[PDB]
Amino acid sequence: DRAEVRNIPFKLGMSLTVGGVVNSNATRFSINVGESTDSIAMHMDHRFSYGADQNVLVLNSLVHNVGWQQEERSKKFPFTKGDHFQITITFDTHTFYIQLSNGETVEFPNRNKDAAFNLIYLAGDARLTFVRLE
Amino acid sequence: DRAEVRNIPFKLGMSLTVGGVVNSNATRFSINVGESTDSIAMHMDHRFSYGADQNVLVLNSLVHNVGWQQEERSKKFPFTKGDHFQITITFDTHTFYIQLSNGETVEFPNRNKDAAFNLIYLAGDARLTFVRLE
Fold this sequence. Notes:
By secondary structure, the first copy, chain A, is mainly β. Chain A contains no helices and 12 strands.
């Protein structure tokens, strides 16, 4: 179902570039970097329409058998249903560095101080079209 | 366990470059392009020591609930246990075009005439370190 890259270590000093296409009537889709679908160190949720959330990015971490931690939000939203997007992520032990399709960036804490991640995945209303992890 | 890229379509005209490291005491490891672990359109097996097979590449397809089809072999074997390797694959409807770490190439028939593949994986005695699928 989901698009994923599994067990190709995403390590300090590497870059992850993902391209895809948002579905036409998307509600929301996320990129996730972590360990599993129940262990995500960087979740970035792209909310076209979700409760009160319209055109907002919501970022958070997910701890296995615990739940979502503190959410962070950004109003930067260079994303269009039906359209291509491209995201690039790098990280060091303190921070995830996220660059969006228009070159705008968001940063999110590396809460575990992890130096590598074995799972990258997209979920929700979109699809991936290319990946560079290197 | 295995390293994989799943549901990022590997389509006609795209290129797949994978880099990794062969384990030190490897027997064999494969790169696979297909549909699932029981449906592989291009299997390329890297046999350091396997029966009578030493330093040989064995290529084949795997049909779901049927089995392996006709094997093809190459004596091109620019691969060292413990060492990095890089492989690039492209394909059109008739052929898979495989380039090895030293620039040597092998070709293998696209037996199904498939135009896209949702699963790429490495199995056996090695690990992946980067991937470009684009």
